[PDB]
Every structure is written in C-alpha cells, then in structure tokens.
Nucleic acid binder design. Structure first.
Ligand SMILES: [Mg+2]
Lengths: 135, 56, 64, 189
RNA sequence: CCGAUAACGAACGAGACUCUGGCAUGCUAACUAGUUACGCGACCCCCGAGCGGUCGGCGUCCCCCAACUUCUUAGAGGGACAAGUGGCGUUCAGCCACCCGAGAUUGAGCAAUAACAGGUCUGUGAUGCCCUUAGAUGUCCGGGGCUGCACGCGCGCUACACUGACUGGCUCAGCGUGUGCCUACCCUACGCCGGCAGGCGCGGGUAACCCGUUGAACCCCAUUCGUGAUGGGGAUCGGGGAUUGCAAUUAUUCCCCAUGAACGAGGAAUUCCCAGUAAGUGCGGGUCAUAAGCUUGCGUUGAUUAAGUCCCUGCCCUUUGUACACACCGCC
C-alpha cells in the first residue's frame, strides 16, 4: 500500500508522453532510459517513478483515449467524426410516420399531401403521465 | 538574523531570501529544484516522404 | 440428548465486530451439510478456508 | 531422514483433528534438525503457521525477562524434555506434543466489555491459530509455574505438563485453565 | 491522487530532498587493508604418503623481490518502479496476492499559516527599565552549605532465585576515544614487585600504523550447592591498605576481611512497545585531577501477540446546535 503518485510525477509523465509518444514504449527499462535525455530529472528515484507511471499510462493509452493527447488518436478521431458518412441518408425514407394531428399543421403551411407522408392512426387512451407519488 | 538596539529594547530581524537557480553558480546555486522537471522541446522530424537514399 | 461437538468451515469473512475489533464475523458451513451455513463471530486470526469447531449449533445471526 | 535432535522421525506423527492440521507444522517441509531457524516469521499475518511447532514452543518457553534472548538454553530444555517424555511414554515425543496441543487448545472463550454481564460478557468461538497459540502459551505457563520454587527441573516440569496434557488427565495446569475458560464461555452463552 | 464542479491559475506544507542500512565475485584502487600462491621455517604423522595437518611464525615495495581485490576500506555508478502475472475497482486513482529479486513500508534529518503572557535576563562583551556600586549585590580569599531527615512523589539500579548462584574451561563485537593556544590533566602495550587496589622501569601511538586481531558480557561446556531468607540479595556497619587532589571529616573513588537487613513477584492505578522490535547483556562518548545507578550511541542474544477498532484517551474532515469568544477550566 501507499503507492500513490503525486502531481510532480503525474504532470511530468503526461507532458513527456504528449511530447515523445512515438519514442516511448511498453518497456519500463527503456522508458527510464529515454527519460534520461528527454527531460532533466534531478533524482533517480524521481526519474524511475516517472518512467513507471509512463509505462502505466501507455498501457492505458494503447486501449483507450486517456486525457493525455496523442496525435494518432487525434487524427483517428478527426477521421471517424468527419467520415463514416452513410452512402444513403437516414432522412430520405420513402414513407414517413405522420400523426393526423401533425398532418393538419402542414396543411396551413400548404406543404401537406406529400407522397412520402403516411397518415397513421393516432393512439387512443391518453394513457400517458406516470402514476403520481410513490407506487 | 540581526539584533537592533533601540531605546525601548531589542528588535529581532530575520531575513530569508530564496536564491534563483542559475547554471553559472554566481548569482545563486547551480542544482535545480529536486521536484522541478524540465522537458526539452524536440523538433518536427515528421518525414512523411517516400523512402529515398542519399548517396555520399 | 446433548448436541455433540461438530465442525464448520469458514467460507467468507464478514468483517470485524466486538466494539474493539477483537472479533471477526465469519460465514461458516457445516462439514456435515454443505448447504446448511450460518454466521458466527470468532476471535483470533481467521482466514477463509479453515475449519473451526462448534460446541453448540445456534448462537447468533445478525448483519452489521 | 531428518530426526529432530538426532532422533524421533517426524513423518510418523498424525494430526488428530482436521481443525488444526493446517496450523500444526511437524511434517514434510516442517522437518528441521533444530528448533532454531530464525526466519522472519512475524513479517506477515498467518506466517507463524508455517513455523515448525517445536520452534514456537522454544520461542514461548523463554519468558519473564530473566531469560528472553536465551534461546540456546530453551533449545536444550526442549531437547531434554523430549528425552524424558520419550522415556516415560515409549512413544514419539512429537506425537505427545501434538496431542498435548490439541487437548490444551481451548475451543470457546468469552469477550465483549458490555458492563461485564455474567463473567466477561458474550461467548465467542476461537480460531485454529489462536487455539494453537493459547495451547503453547498455557503449556509454557504451566511448566514455568510448576518448576518455579521447587527442586524439579524445567525439563521435568515441561515433560510432565506435556504428558498430562496429551493424556487429558486434568492434572495439568493447561487443561485446568482450558476447562475453566470453556465453563465461563458456557455461562456467557 | 482520480474525478464532479463558478471556478481558473498558482504558492507553502505533505511528497520530493540529504544522511544512513540492505545488493552488487561488475569498475577504480590499495605495506596505514587483506586473501591466495610460493619459499624458509616450528610442531605432529610417520607404517607411508607429503600437493599430508596447524601456525595472527618469517619473507616474496627491505623495489625488482608473486599475483588478486572475494573478505576490509570508499568513490564513481547501477539497482526497486506497484515494474511483471492473477483478481478487485467506474476498470480511473489505486488495493490485495503471487513470481523473480538483496530489497515490494530500513531508520533518521529537515519540516507550513497562526499562536502560547509555555521556558530561558543563572549561556553570551544579546538586551530596555529598575536596584546596587567601596562597610559593594563588583571581585578575591578562608570555612560551612548545596548531601542536612518524623514524611509524601517521580525517573532508575539491584533483587526476590535451581530457566539459578559459585568455581573452572572454552568462545565470539561494533560504535568510538586517545598527549592539551589559553590549560596543568592522554590511550596504553611489555618486563618486574604485590594477594588486590596499585607501584616501579622501558617503550609505541597526534593514530586503518600503538593500545588493538579491541581475547567484552550474556551465552556454551564441566564442578559444588538443593527449595531453606539457603552458597539467593548485599543494604547497613567495623577494621585495615592504596590512588587523585592544595585539602577526602559530613565516609571522592578503588581493594581486602568481617555483618547478611528488608525482599518469597508486589493493591488501586499506570508506562512503553510491532521485527533484528520488546527484553536480557555488556562496551564506548559526555560530564571527568577522582569518578556513572544518568544520558547519548554501539554491538551481542533475541521473542510473545496483532495486520484490527473507535470501547476508553485523544486527533482530523463534514453536517449540526449554541445565550461561549479570557472561547466548557466558558457562561449562568
Ligand atoms: Mg556464598
């Protein structure tokens, strides 16, 4: 127990992972060596605590989007978001479910009686609203 | 720490000055703060071009 | 007539008790019947998977 | 092949009750030539159960300040007491010690400080580890009290304490104390 | 610390840091450290070994006349990160267990804002005020006192015994000190005398060079004692002998022979303590002309119990109530 890492190591690990994600890897004994030259760390204990947290954070990064930024994950996001645009829209459906109450609204706006509109049967019962209070 | 003798008694003066860090070691100390981590800034070094080979 | 001394094996530890931490409550199942199991407070260092003897069948059952 | 104190093979000893088999350490890897193998047995919980029981007896037998570090003397005392118990019984001293521990370890006790209800307060069961610890403590206390102000040697008093506890004759201090504890636990049920 | 977020960005403290301990047959080195090997020896075996066994005996930096750094010393470095595996966890921060490993919580030092009518004017040529300043409260000298005892309390030492005491044999340390500005007073080997404390000559050491390979105690192995206030305990007290000092009476200390008192494990209460720890057990340093029952350190032997709780004693955070704010030892 008592193995909590403080701001001094966590912020440094996040910064060096952001700057040198490509060079860094899954090996603790190699991350401790790259930490020799990517930053000036006054103490060996501080440097290997930082290296251990770096390896832990890289294990987290290889699976998920940790708050520490990464250019590969950033460009993958910037791809997914602007892409997977479907070849056919979800808004060009041939038939559209239209309530008769909603149907009269289009009549005033004189855009009703379209082919894609299908006048359904409105629900009967008015059974909405949850039972009040407990039970 | 310095004592000052006034007609009412003695005034004690304590002055602490945190020296600035400097590699020259003249205006202050040379070692950095133990918890201060300075990360050097790399260059771009992207190199997205096709694989070529310089001949020299 | 009197109930004989029997054995019960600890399956789970339910935390300390006794107003001083001096007892720990453990769920124990009788070696005679695996299904039949109760909870008893015992003293001394206890870990799951050990057998302790019982001089009586029922003494106590409560949840803290 | 080990022969604790040069004799009395350990493999011939069988543990009586299932409850204390995992906590009495006499056989297989718990087979040492001497009961002095200081090996950091207090560094973690449930590690003294891996300490051989003769070493536990030796550690518990040096008490009351006048002899606290004198473990070589206690090893010698245990060796002699084993010689006497083998001489009296004809059976294995390790078996006698095991049976004495089984019969001396109390099975129930009392606890809680709720205004001291009847004797202590509320009855409680005891763990196997505490059974072993209290058995060894009771045996050592009985031997010490028996041999304090008289001509009988520590080895002889330890021998007769262990013999009486193994045979359950109720002539032993450990057995009498165990019976008293069980009685007050019954009253505090 | 992760996260939620009218907060964001910071600063101190904690941590980080320094010293110490544990591992490096890896590097650097060693006549003020050694180890091996070899040559001279000395003793035993000699049937017959003989590259036999022992030597803290002498040599091979007495410079051409051996190597090496494992042991010792001490520097540079390395090494441990919750790093690897399994499980728990929002799968976050982390937690538990296990493997490999010397090491998976080694001990210390330092240590915030604010404060106390806490202690020191008897540490200071630190100091305000006041007092005294020649029949002195200055300073010096002589003597006495600080020790004085119907009694109460605190820190300790020795014990109450056979898990012991006495007698003998054997056997193992680590800290660290050691010849003086003034200032006079060091640690001591070896030989002789004495029963002892000691005394008398000769050295060595300003020191990994000499004490010193610190032949420590406990422990270990043999002897006597035999459950008794006994060979337990050594208080009290008589006589004698030395040492320090200018001086030993109100015994400075040490030695010898006599006396062997309470004390047979201690009420109510109450202290300290989690691993090389408690405790047993000695040895250094400080004080020291003479000196430790004190203290500060060091080694040696070396455990029982526990890996929890808020019950007592308190502490921290939140909510809450308050007529308190000299803050519940309050107020009324
Ligand atoms: Mg005598």
């Amino acid at each position: 127990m008592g193995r909590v890492r403080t701001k001094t190591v966590k912020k440094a690990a996040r910064v060096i992972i952001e700057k040198y994600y490509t060079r860094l890897g899954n090996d603790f004994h190699t991350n401790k060596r790259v930490c020799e030259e990517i930053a000036i760390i006054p103490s060996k204990k501080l440097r290997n605590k930082i290296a251990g947290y770096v390896t832990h954070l890289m294990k987290r990064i290889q699976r998920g989007p940790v708050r520490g930024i990464s250019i590969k994950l950033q460009e993958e996001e910037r791809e997914r978001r602007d892409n997977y645009v479907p070849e056919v829209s979800a808004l060009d459906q041939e038939i559209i479910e239209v309530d008769p109450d909603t149907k009269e609204m289009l009549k005033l706006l004189d855009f009703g009686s379209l082919s894609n509109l299908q006048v359904t049967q409105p629900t009967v019962g008015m059974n909405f609203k949850t039972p009040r209070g407990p039970v | 720490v310095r004592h000052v003798l006034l007609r009412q008694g003695v005034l004690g003066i304590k002055v602490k000055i945190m020296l600035p860090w400097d590699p020259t070691g003249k205006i202050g100390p040379k070692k950095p703060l133990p918890d201060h981590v300075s990360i050097v800034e790399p260059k771009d070094e992207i190199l997205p071009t096709t694989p070529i080979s310089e001949q020299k | 007539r009197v109930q004989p001394i029997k054995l019960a094996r600890v399956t789970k530890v339910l935390g300390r008790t006794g107003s001083q931490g001096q007892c720990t409550q453990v769920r124990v199942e009788f070696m005679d019947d695996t299904s039949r199991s109760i909870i008893r407070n015992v003293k001394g260092p206890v870990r799951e998977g050990d057998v302790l003897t019982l001089l009586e069948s029922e003494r106590e059952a409560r949840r803290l | 092949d080990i022969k604790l104190f040069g004799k009395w093979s350990t493999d011939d000893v069988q543990i009586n009750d299932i409850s204390l088999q995992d906590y009495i350490a006499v056989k297989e890897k718990y087979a040492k030539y001497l009961p002095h193998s200081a090996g950091r047995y207090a560094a973690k919980r449930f590690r003294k159960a891996q300490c051989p029981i003769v070493e536990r007896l030796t550690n518990s037998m040096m008490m009351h300040g006048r002899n606290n570090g004198k473990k070589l003397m206690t090893v010698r005392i245990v060796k002699h007491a084993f010689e006497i118990i083998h001489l009296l019984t004809g059976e294995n001293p390790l078996q006698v010690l095991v049976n004495a521990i089984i019969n001396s370890g109390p099975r129930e006790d009392s606890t809680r400080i709720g205004r001291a209800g009847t004797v202590r307060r509320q009855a409680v069961d005891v763990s196997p580890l505490r059974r072993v610890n209290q058995a060894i403590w009771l045996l050592c206390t009985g031997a010490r009290e028996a041999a304090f102000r008289n001509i009988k040697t520590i080895a002889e008093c330890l021998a007769d304490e262990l013999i009486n506890a193994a045979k359950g004759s109720s002539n032993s201090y450990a057995i009498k104390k165990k019976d008293e504890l069980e009685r007050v636990a019954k009253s505090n049920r």
